[PDB]
Amino acid sequence: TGQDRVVALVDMDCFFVQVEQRQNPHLRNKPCAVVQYKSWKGGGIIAVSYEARAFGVTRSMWADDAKKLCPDLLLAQVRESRGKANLTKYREASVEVMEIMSRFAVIERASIDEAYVDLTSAVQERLQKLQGQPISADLLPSTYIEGLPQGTVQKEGMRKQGLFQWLDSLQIDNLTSPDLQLTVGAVIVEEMRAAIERETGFQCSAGISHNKVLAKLACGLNKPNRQTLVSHGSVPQLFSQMPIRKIRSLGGKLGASVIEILGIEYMGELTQFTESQLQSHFGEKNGSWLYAMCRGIEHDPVKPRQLPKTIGCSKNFPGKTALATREQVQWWLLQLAQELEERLTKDRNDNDRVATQLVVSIRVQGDKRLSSLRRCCALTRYDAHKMSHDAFTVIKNCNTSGIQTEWSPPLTMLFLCATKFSA
DNA sequence: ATCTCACACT
DNA sequence: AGTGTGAG
Numbered sequence: 257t258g259q260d261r262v263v264a265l266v267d268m269d270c271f272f273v274q275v276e277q278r279q280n281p282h283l284r285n286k287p288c289a290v291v292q293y294k295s296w297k298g299g300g301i302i303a304v305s306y307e308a309r310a311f312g313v314t315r316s317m318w319a320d321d322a323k324k325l326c327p328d329l330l331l332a333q334v335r336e337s338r339g340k341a342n343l344t345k346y347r348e349a350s351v352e353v354m355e356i357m358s359r360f361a362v363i364e365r366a367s368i369d370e371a372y373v374d375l376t377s378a379v380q381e382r383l384q385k386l387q388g389q390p391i392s393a394d395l396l397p398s399t400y401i402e403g404l405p406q407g408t409v410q411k412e413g414m415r416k417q418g419l420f421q422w423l424d425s426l427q428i429d430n431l432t433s434p435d436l437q438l439t440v441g442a443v444i445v446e447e448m449r450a451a452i453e454r455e456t457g458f459q460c461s462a463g464i465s466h467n468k469v470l471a472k473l474a475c476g477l478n479k480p481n482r483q484t485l486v487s488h489g490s491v492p493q494l495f496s497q498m499p500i501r502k503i504r505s506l507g508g509k510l511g512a513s514v515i516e517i518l519g520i521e522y523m524g525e526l527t528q529f530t531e532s533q534l535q536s537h538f539g540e541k542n543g544s545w546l547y548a549m550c551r552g553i554e555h556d557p558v559k560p561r562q563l564p565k566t567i568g569c570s571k572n573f574p575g576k577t578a579l580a581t582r583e584q585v586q587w588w589l590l591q592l593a594q595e596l597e598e599r600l601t602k603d604r605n606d607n608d609r610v611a612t613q614l615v616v617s618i619r620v621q622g623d624k625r626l627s628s629l630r631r632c633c634a635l636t637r638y639d640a641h642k643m644s645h646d647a648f649t650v651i652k653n654c655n656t657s658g659i660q661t662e663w664s665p666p667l668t669m670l671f672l673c674a675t676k677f678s679a
Numbered sequence: 680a681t682c683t684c685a686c687a688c689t
Numbered sequence: 690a691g692t693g694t695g696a697g
């Protein structure tokens with residue numbers, strides 16, 4: 257019943273904000289945000305401290321408008337190189353945190369600031385080492401048990417009541433107990449998070465459950481600077497009022513279609529349907545996935561992959577800034593290829609691998625789709641001038657304009673991506 | 680006028 | 690190999 261693994265998800269709190277607060281002490285414990293391309297309406301916000309969220313500041317907001325909502329908002333700007341945002345500082349801090357997490361167990365890098373952890377073997381080790389010894393609440397100073405307490409008005413008071421109920425109810429005698437395994441997982445995650453904060457300064461949240469989807473959902477339940485354990489038995493109560501769209505992979509069109517076709521709102525309602533009924537509407541794979549997921553069962557593995565499988569660089573050119581001349585297209589392809597060259601040379605030196613295929617993608621003014629065209633070619637020698645020339649070669653036939661010097665329709669996006677790594 | 684990543688089809 | 694989808 258989806259209890260074969262113990263999986264955690266560790267996600268950093270306001271990651272880019274914490275990076276900037278580490279760098280600049282003036283930003284600590286203040287409402288602040290990270291910004292991009294300041295000239296247009298003060299820049300687009302990409303990260304927001306929890307103090308700023310209390311005022312209603314959100315990501316994707318223009319900085320000028322956030323300043324309208326939060327006049328004391330402090331701002332840190334993403335580095336800009338070659339006319340575009342440069343995330344090196346955050347990638348390096350991410351690597352720092354991934355390296356600390358890698359000492360405890362195999363991790364799967366799920367984004368710049370979160371990784372999944374398969375803790376099964378660590379749990380087995382810690383249960384044989386920790387033979388029948390009771391687990392003290394002191395080992396879980398920041399852990400919430402979702403669904404408890406049940407059956408007095410402060411947040412931490414409730415947390416402690418729930419943790420006491422949890423440890424009181426389940427015994428260490430049977431070491432195949434899923435709930436005990438989850439609890440040992442949570443102890444390990446407390447240790448991991450303490451190590452991360454000690455060695456980097458960054459605080460983070462985590463979810464501990466039996467699979468990746470529940471771990472991700474749990475992590476968000478008690479942000480920030482806390483962790484949440486979602487037990488198998490907690491799933492029905494958790495899911496009974498949990499919107500479908502909150503579940504990983506159901507936040508888009510498929511989730512909307514599940515809501516529309518089945519006439520439900522919450523994840524638990526999926527349980528009433530048989531597997532073959534769900535496979536009828538959503539296909540064998542989606543039907544079986546929904547059928548298992550709504551009961552708290554998921555098998556997607558924590559992949560042993562800390563490093564990205566591709567290295568890409570994209571820039572949009574919206575509205576009047578769209579690229580309309582051949583000279584413009586070649587210059588921006590060069591800029592993208594130069595950043596790509598830097599990141600690729602560093603990647604080969606750090607990670608002992610080389611990309612062998614270059615993917616070029618563009619968008620044309622008018623196309624509603626994010627990408628209009630994607631093509632490929634050989635990738636050799638990590639040379640920005642060569643890569644940019646090859647990209648121009650592979651897209652040049654897309655220029656409708658009869659005049660060679662002009663490009664039409666204007667380009668609203670450029671994308672270079674290195675793929676197909678070899679040792 | 681909000682950029683990277685993954686993977687499932689075909 | 691190219692498109693659509695989901696996410697963070």
Ligand SMILES: Cc1cn([C@H]2C[C@H](O)[C@@H](COP(=O)(O)NP(=O)(O)OP(=O)(O)O)O2)c(=O)[nH]c1=O
Nearest residue numbers: 267268269270271272302303304368369479697
């Ligand atoms: C959704 C999104 C996130 N990010 C960055 C901002 C975050 O710093 C980083 C981590 O994603 P997140 O964990 O979902 N958000 P957060 O890390 O800022 O904060 P928290 O984990 O919710 O506390 O991803 C983007 O750069 N473009 C985006 O569209």
Ligand SMILES: [Mn+2]
Nearest residue numbers: 267268269270
């Ligand atoms: Mn985060």
Ligand SMILES: [Mn+2]
Nearest residue numbers: 267367369370
């Ligand atoms: Mn994240």
